[PDB]
Design a protein around this nucleic acid. Structure first.
Ligand SMILES: OC[C@H]1O[C@H](O[C@H]2[C@H](O)[C@@H](O)[C@@H](O)O[C@@H]2CO)[C@H](O)[C@@H](O)[C@@H]1O
Ligand SMILES: OC[C@H]1O[C@H](O[C@H]2[C@H](O)[C@@H](O)[C@@H](O)O[C@@H]2CO)[C@H](O)[C@@H](O)[C@@H]1O
Lengths: 437, 437
DNA sequence: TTTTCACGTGAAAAA
DNA sequence: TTTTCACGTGAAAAA
């Protein structure tokens, strides 16, 4: 798709309140005559950098802030220039999450952290530690239930446990992240991922469990706990499950440390609707009534807007969300973040499946997360060097075939021309290429 | 994932009644003690042949019958051997859909055909012809609505119109499909795809419209018509939309000809639970109560089970589904069907997008849908040949470097060795490789 | 950092 | 059908 003057197209992930967001768009259209279409395509955070590089893609893209630095580094985002008055309405630290190289590159919407979600009827007293989950599962398995099910396909969900005893993504020092100091392969990271793999080995979890499988199992009353974010609460509300939201369990006596995301809205640099997008975000979405419409659809978490967060903070589930968030860390927004996430995703999936040992999976993840992506020009230099290497050899063989008079067959390969050349120069060449004088 | 004794795992597409099917699995568990897990992973029809070739995958896989011949040809499916008593319970033509090389390779469940779905309040008298939809849209756009929106990303939904004037997949003659006689590039197919592209060029449809975008627009009352199958009726019921289901429009005076699918359930050849899977399918799912539970979740269409279809056939929506199905054709189940579908998908997306002309897109689709996939042995033959060709050359250069005593630099490539060889044989080789005596 | 050669599949060609 | 060479990026090496 390409953006067109006079209409707004928004992309947002399918686990968020896109129907509530569309109601906001319908009000924007009611007051200004500008159509707003909300879409939730799959893998939007990978599609956006592919299409926006040439001016395609939506007017506005919603994702957690960790993806946005790479978008800005590629020039895909318009600089966000809210007046000081508007900036004041949002918590300072949410603006920090969307600051890249000194510029604001998105509007912050809401703060997301994972929490432990548990079925109060099956589990009145949720476990305080990861270590006691195996025995809790054994007791539940005898009732035809399980202890815990959560998405093992996305490393976001396993990261709180990997980070608990010391794993980290990029080390922060002297005011900046060191993209070369990755902590996915230290003792704490191994201890965390070993405990998860051990859960699978002992049949307390299944390696293939994904988002929809864990959500169905919890919301149908088949497992006593899951790990998820606020967006998941509305589907649990509609289910028959009486659930609670609480702090994640400790591991080796230390808090689980979820990576905290700030859902943010960036404006496509290629949009011809930049001013309409700013009006929609600042004056319709980032208002009490705006965030309420989206929040009523799927909870946003702790919104960046101070006036409405004063209402949402009253909610015990938000209090638990932010207890977990305080124990975690805000994600970096640096371009290297996507390479870090791909590396850890591969490591978790390969260790859970048994395709790699924990040490092997994390050793590769450390190397992959730190690997510098070759620039376009570096790839092009390499492409041209081999093109030229082939073109020089091809010219040599062309001239040998045309002037050699080598008594060759009608059809033969260049190895046979090379052989005839060798013998002409006084060499002997065996069938397998063994060559001597 | 791997199958394991005493447990049943089922894969079904996410637009079907998987919650209702899980209800049948829960009754199975109560009666026999066998746990049943229903999953709806993405792209399951592509994942299944990838994992089943090695013994992985689910116990049971649900898909339209057109995919199953390819699975059978690869040895992925157990032969289905129901007693005559049970075969008698399903319509003979549904069994024909799951017979491949003389053997039954799945249980038929239900017959699917696309119909025209229309908003009664927006459009009390739906159009009878494709040709009048442009002017209908113009009139509707003045009121802020649109005429028609349907999934343009999957060629299933566009095929009815492509086939209307004479497009076809594989020609049927003398009792067999001719895998080399593909009809995606004749005048009838060109005419139908041109009309569709013309719809986009005149702004009556959007090239990027997919399943969820079209579903949302119809169910929110923004478009007067959509094209979809029975599984979609349940979300329309829940909406505020008053809808009818009717015959697809004609094109150039001829009926739209949907490809008719038979939702079918195959048993993984690697499953250690083949007998339990037979019992689940024959005695729990393919009963009045089992199909009812699934149907109440998302309508199945015209079920293969005679006793329950006598009840369903009385729904005017099913009568319209079967009026469309009579005008269409049952899909082949031959292994080539997947190559046909990929080819047409690429043609529709490329023409709708403007990257290719309709003629250019359908020309490639014809060759693509007829292309014979090279065998494993053929690929390995080619791989080894190049391995061998490189090894011969490398041995030659190893011998020249070791015994040539050419005045070579410390580090140089094999082109520089070739050059020295040429000069020794009496040749002159310029920098770009131009070679002569 | 740049440089060499491996790698297996596609496009072109001859039959 | 088989055959040749192009193609660009990865593994290894030298610095
Ligand atoms: O799993 C890697 C993934 O983690 C985060 O994505 C979260 C997202 O922040 C949440 O809004 C929610 O949708 O769940 C996602 C995980 O499935 C990162 O934001 C993302 O970049 C990263 O790939
Ligand atoms: O679009 C190509 C696709 O068409 C059919 O898939 C249908 C399926 O039969 C229906 O049950 C429903 O789910 O919609 C699908 C289209 O998205 C073929 O059965 C399938 O093999 C083919 O790829």
């Amino acid at each position: 798709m390409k953006i067109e003057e006079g209409k707004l197209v928004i992309w947002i992930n399918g686990d968020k309140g896109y129907n509530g967001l569309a109601e906001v768009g319908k009000k924007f259209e009611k007051d200004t005559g500008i159509k707003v279409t909300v879409e939730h395509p799959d893998k939007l955070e990978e599609k956006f950098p592919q299409v926006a590089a040439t001016g395609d893609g939506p007017d506005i893209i919603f994702w957690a802030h960790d993806r946005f630095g790479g978008y800005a580094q590629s020039g895909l985002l318009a600089e966000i220039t809210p007046a000081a008055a508007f900036q004041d309405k949002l918590y300072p630290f949410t603006w920090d999450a969307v600051r890249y190289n000194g510029k604001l590159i998105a509007y912050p919407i809401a703060v997301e952290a994972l929490s432990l979600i548990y079925n109060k009827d099956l589990l009145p007293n949720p476990p305080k530690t990861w270590e006691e989950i195996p025995a809790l599962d054994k007791e539940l398995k005898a009732k035809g239930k399980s202890a815990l099910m959560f998405n093992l396909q996305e490393p976001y969900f396993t990261w709180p446990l990997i980070a608990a005893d010391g794993g980290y993504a990029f080390k922060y020092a002297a005011g900046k992240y060191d993209i070369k100091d990755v902590g996915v392969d230290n003792a704490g990271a191994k201890a965390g991922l070993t405990f998860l793999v051990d859960l699978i080995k002992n049949k307390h979890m299944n390696a293939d469990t994904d988002y929809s499988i864990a959500e169905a199992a919890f919301n149908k009353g088949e497992t006593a706990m899951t790990i998820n974010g606020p967006w998941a609460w509305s589907n649990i509300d509609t289910s028959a499950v009486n659930y609670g939201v609480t702090v994640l369990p400790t591991f080796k006596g230390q808090p689980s440390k979820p990576f905290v995301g700030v859902l943010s809205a960036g404006i496509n640099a290629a949009s011809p609707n930049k001013e309409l997008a700013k009006e929609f975000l600042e004056n319709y979405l980032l208002t009490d009534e705006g965030l309420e419409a989206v929040n009523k659809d799927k909870p946003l978490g702790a919104v960046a807007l101070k006036s409405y967060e004063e209402e949402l903070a009253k909610d015990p589930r938000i209090a638990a969300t932010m207890e977990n968030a305080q124990k975690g860390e805000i994600m970096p927004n640096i371009p290297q973040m996507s390479a870090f996430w791909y590396a850890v995703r591969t490591a978790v999936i390969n260790a859970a499946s048994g395709r790699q040992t924990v040490d092997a999976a994390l050793a590769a993840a450390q190397t992959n997360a730190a690997r510098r992506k070759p620039s376009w020009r570096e790839r092009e230099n390499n492409r041209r060097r081999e093109r030229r290497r082939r073109a020089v050899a091809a010219k040599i063989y062309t001239g040998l075939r045309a002037q050699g008079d080598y008594n060759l067959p009608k059809h033969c390969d260049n190895n046979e021309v090379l052989k005839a050349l060798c013998v002409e120069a006084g060499w002997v060449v065996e069938e397998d290429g063994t060559t001597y004088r």
